[PDB]
Amino acid sequence: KSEVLNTSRLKEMVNPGDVTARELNQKQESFQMTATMVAASNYNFIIDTTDHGTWRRLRHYRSKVKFCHNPDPSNPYEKKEDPRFIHEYIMDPDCQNAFFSILVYFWEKLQKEYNGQIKKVFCPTIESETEAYRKSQDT
Amino acid sequence: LHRFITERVVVYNLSEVVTAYAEWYNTNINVKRHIALELSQELENSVLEKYLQWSP
Numbered sequence: 035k036s037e038v039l040n041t042s043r044l045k046e047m048v049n050p051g052d053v054t055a056r057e058l059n060q061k062q063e064s065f066q067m068t069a070t071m072v073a074a075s076n077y078n079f080i081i082d083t084t085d086h087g088t089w090r091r092l093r094h095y096r097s098k099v100k101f102c103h104n105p106d107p108s109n110p111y112e113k114k115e116d117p118r119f120i121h122e123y124i125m126d127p128d129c130q131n132a133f134f135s136i137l138v139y140f141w142e143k144l145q146k147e148y149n150g151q152i153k154k155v156f157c158p159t160i161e162s163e164t165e166a167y168r169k170s171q172d173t
Numbered sequence: 174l175h176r177f178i179t180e181r182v183v184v185y186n187l188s189e190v191v192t193a194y195a196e197w198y199n200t201n202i203n204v205k206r207h208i209a210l211e212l213s214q215e216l217e218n219s220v221l222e223k224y225l226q227w228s229p
Contacts, residue, residue: 035208036208036210036211077211078210
C-alpha cells in the first residue's frame with residue numbers, strides 16, 4: 035500500500051548527528067548513525083511538506099525496465115524473468131565474492147575521483163527525475 | 174473494481190466515482206478505509222479508463 039512519510043522520524047535517519055533510543059530490558063542509549071539507507075515500493079510515497087530542509091536530502095528515481103513471463107514486443111524496457119536469479123544465483127558463494135569485488139572496486143573509484151563526497155558526481159537523469167517528483171506531491 | 178463497474182457504472186474529477194467506490198466497498202464488501210491517492214490510477218487501470226479523461 036502507499037505509505038505516508040511523517041516528515042519526522044526521518045531527520046534522525048538522514049542527518050549525520052546522534053540519536054537516542056531505548057532497548058527492551060535495559061536503559062536508554064545514544065549512538066552515531068553510520069548507515070546507508072535505501073527504500074523502494076510499487077506505490078508512490080507521501081511527502082506532505084515542501085520546505086527545503088526536507089527536500090535537501092532524499093534522491094528519487096523511477097525504474098523504466100520491466101520483466102514479464104512473455105517478452106511482449108514494441109517495448110525495449112520489457113524483458114523476461116530469470117527464476118534462477120531468485121531460486122539460486124544468490125546463495126552461490128562465487129557470485130557473492132564477485133559482487134563484493136565489484137563493490138570494493140566501485141568504492142575505490144569513488145575514492146580516487148570526485149574526492150570523497152558523493153554530492154559531487156553529476157547525474158542529470160537523477161536530478162531531473164527528482165525535480166519532476168518534487169513538482170508532484172505538491173498539493 | 175470490475176464488479177462495481179458492471180453493476181453500477183453506466184473532466185471526470187473522480188470525486189463522485191471515489192465516493193461511490195469507497196461507500197460501495199465499505200458496504201457491499203466489508204468495512205475499511207479507502208485512501209484514494211493512487212486509486213485514480215487504479216481506476217485508470219480498469220476498463221473505465223478508455224471512457225475517462227485523465228486530465229482534471
